[PDB]
Design an enzyme around this catalytic site. Structure first.
Site, mmCIF file in Angstrom:
data_model
loop_
_atom_site.group_PDB
_atom_site.id
_atom_site.type_symbol
_atom_site.label_atom_id
_atom_site.label_comp_id
_atom_site.label_asym_id
_atom_site.label_seq_id
_atom_site.Cartn_x
_atom_site.Cartn_y
_atom_site.Cartn_z
ATOM 1 N N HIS B 29 -12.339 -29.555 45.280
ATOM 2 C CA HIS B 29 -11.191 -30.232 44.777
ATOM 3 C C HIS B 29 -9.801 -29.973 45.585
ATOM 4 O O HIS B 29 -8.571 -30.834 45.551
ATOM 5 C CB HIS B 29 -10.812 -29.880 43.259
ATOM 6 C CG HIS B 29 -10.365 -28.553 43.293
ATOM 7 N ND1 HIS B 29 -11.236 -27.313 43.264
ATOM 8 C CD2 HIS B 29 -8.958 -27.985 43.196
ATOM 9 C CE1 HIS B 29 -10.546 -26.060 43.183
ATOM 10 N NE2 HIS B 29 -9.361 -26.565 43.044
ATOM 11 N N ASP B 51 -18.015 -28.646 41.940
ATOM 12 C CA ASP B 51 -16.892 -28.691 42.593
ATOM 13 C C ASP B 51 -16.863 -27.843 43.929
ATOM 14 O O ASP B 51 -15.889 -26.925 44.363
ATOM 15 C CB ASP B 51 -15.588 -27.833 41.947
ATOM 16 C CG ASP B 51 -15.253 -28.798 40.694
ATOM 17 O OD1 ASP B 51 -15.065 -30.078 40.761
ATOM 18 O OD2 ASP B 51 -15.518 -28.237 39.579
ATOM 19 N N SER B 103 -7.719 -21.054 44.766
ATOM 20 C CA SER B 103 -8.882 -21.685 44.699
ATOM 21 C C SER B 103 -9.705 -21.207 45.938
ATOM 22 O O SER B 103 -9.066 -21.120 46.877
ATOM 23 C CB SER B 103 -8.927 -22.893 44.309
ATOM 24 O OG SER B 103 -8.598 -23.737 45.427
#
Lengths: 48, 151, 151
Positions: B29, B51, B103
């Site tokens: 993402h 993801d 992330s």
């Protein structure tokens, strides 16, 4: 002519057999490929 | 601990790629490319349900790969912004300990092995539940707390 | 140790033959003959799959063959030219620890048992992964890192 017209629906039996054999041949390959994809999707869906 | 092998992947950094085992791993993402040209040039295989994007680590930089394990006993784990509590099968941190742009951060066990990669999290009062990528024996799975946002 | 025999090429040493269990093991990529005439005259069976040439040891006059094990826990092993680290499925040494001509050298565990025979390795930057011959409880297997070269 003493008879009526032929139409598209009237095909020889030998030719009809060939059409079903070829149509079935491809349809079967698709059905198999479809089953494989469905199984993979179901397994992929089940796993998380 | 000091195995800081997170690699930033944008001019405005938005998450990190990490070298784990034989693979380069980054969140799917996050936008942008890896700053290290040796990794940026690699083809990545993308999976939208996990993801996650991955590629093989080039041999010449494979020595920098971190160690990993599938073992995830209840207890404490560490990461770049603090400690991570593993409880009830979920990874939890103090609220505000992480933020958007984190992330891709690895979570390490007490042996320095990677157990999970952070994608995001959800705010539950003083504690934040993490959305992470984890491994079982020979398989990758994802844990997503309800209402979790991407980082 | 002292179960290691030189493999003599026309003008140099190109590797070693090791006595393990009841067999004398030599890497197939090594060219030349064993320095000891008693082993040089011994017939060998070659396998390109495992890069091995093995023959039964004349144990009646060769009782100095090393003991061996199939057990491979993570930890450190002694391979003559230094310490070798075992992690995951691979053996790892410092890049300058080994070189061409060192193949045929065994890796020993901390109990003095032979675990693996070194064939070569790949330079991963800080460390080099070794291409080795190992065995499980039943058969011999070969582990080769990507880009590994014969030594």
């Amino acid at each position: 002519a003493s008879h009526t017209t032929l139409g598209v629906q009237d095909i020889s039996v030998t030719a009809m057999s060939w059409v079903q054999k070829i149509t079935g041949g491809v349809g079967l390959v698709v059905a198999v490929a479809a089953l494989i994809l469905i199984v993979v999707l179901c397994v992929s869906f089940s796993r998380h | 601990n000091d195995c800081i092998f997170e690699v930033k992947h944008e001019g405005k950094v938005t998450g990190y790629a990490c070298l784990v085992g034989d693979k380069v791993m980054k969140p799917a993402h996050v936008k942008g490319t890896i700053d290290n040209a040796d990794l940026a040039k690699l083809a990545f295989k993308r999976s939208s349900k996990y993801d996650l994007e991955c590629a093989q680590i080039p041999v010449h930089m494979k020595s920098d790969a971190s160690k990993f394990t599938h073992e995830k006993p209840e207890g404490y784990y560490n990461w770049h912004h603090g400690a991570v509590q593993y409880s009830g099968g979920r990874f939890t941190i103090p609220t505000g300990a992480g933020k958007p742009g984190d992330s891709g951060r690895p979570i390490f066990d007490n042996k320095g092995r990677v157990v999970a990669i952070v994608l995001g999290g959800a705010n539950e009062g003083a504690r934040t539940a993490l959305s992470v990528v984890t491994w079982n024996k020979d398989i990758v799975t994802k844990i997503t707390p309800e209402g979790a946002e991407e980082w």
